[PDB]
Amino acid sequence: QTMCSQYDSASSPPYSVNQNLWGEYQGTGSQCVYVDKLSSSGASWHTEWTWSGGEGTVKSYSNSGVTFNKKLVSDVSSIPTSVEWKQDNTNVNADVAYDLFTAANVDHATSSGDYELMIWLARYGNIQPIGKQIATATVGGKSWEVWYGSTTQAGAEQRTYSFVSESPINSYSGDINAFFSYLTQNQGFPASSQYLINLQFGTEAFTGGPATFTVDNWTASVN
């Protein structure tokens, strides 16, 4: 499947590959997502993009996602995931990251939440997470810079926690629940009153290109 319009999705329950150019009007360029292999066991895809203008603003977040029974973070047993990706052309402003949202209302829209947990496997150019660094933590046998900041739009505030690796991690696997556990015990995260409502992985593109982001394989589950 080749997807080049603003919003498109291809799915094979529980996996999906999504073209999402939500910040398209902030600049000039083009981007398509190509499904390489999509089945109930995992997703393989790539995206080629070129964006100019609106420096510092995200133009898109093409990604692969997984559907699951939404539940309280405190009730989550494990969130196993694995991925292998590659970036062709690093002279760009972009990041490679997992994006998870939680909300006090299980019926909350999945495009945002009360809290957002981001796990950056790579950072390119001059971009940086929202807020400021508040710690460095060891999660899953790896060291991460812990960033925290908030944003407000249309009357709703979103608190974002970002775990950033020092250098690119192209092959990664682990239990994402370990990050929630850290937040619950070390940053007062309200795990017993927040529902996990979305889990995605992809690349946020700001400016630069032509560039190609490739996901050789991606798996994820919420138990």
UniProtKB/TrEMBL annotation:
Belongs to the glycosyl hydrolase 12 (cellulase H) family. PANTHER family: BLR1656 PROTEIN, PUTATIVE-RELATED. The gene is eglA. Keywords: Carbohydrate metabolism, Glycosidase, Hydrolase, Polysaccharide degradation, Signal, Transferase. It comes from Aspergillus niger. GO terms for biological process: polysaccharide catabolic process. It comes from the Eukaryota. Pfam families: Glyco_hydro_12. Disulfide bonds join C4-C32. Its EC number is 3.2.1.4. InterPro entries: ConA-like_dom_sf, GH11/12, GH12. GO terms for molecular function: cellulase activity; transferase activity. It is an enzyme of class 3 (hydrolase). Coiled coil: none annotated. This is Acetyltransferase (GNAT) family protein.
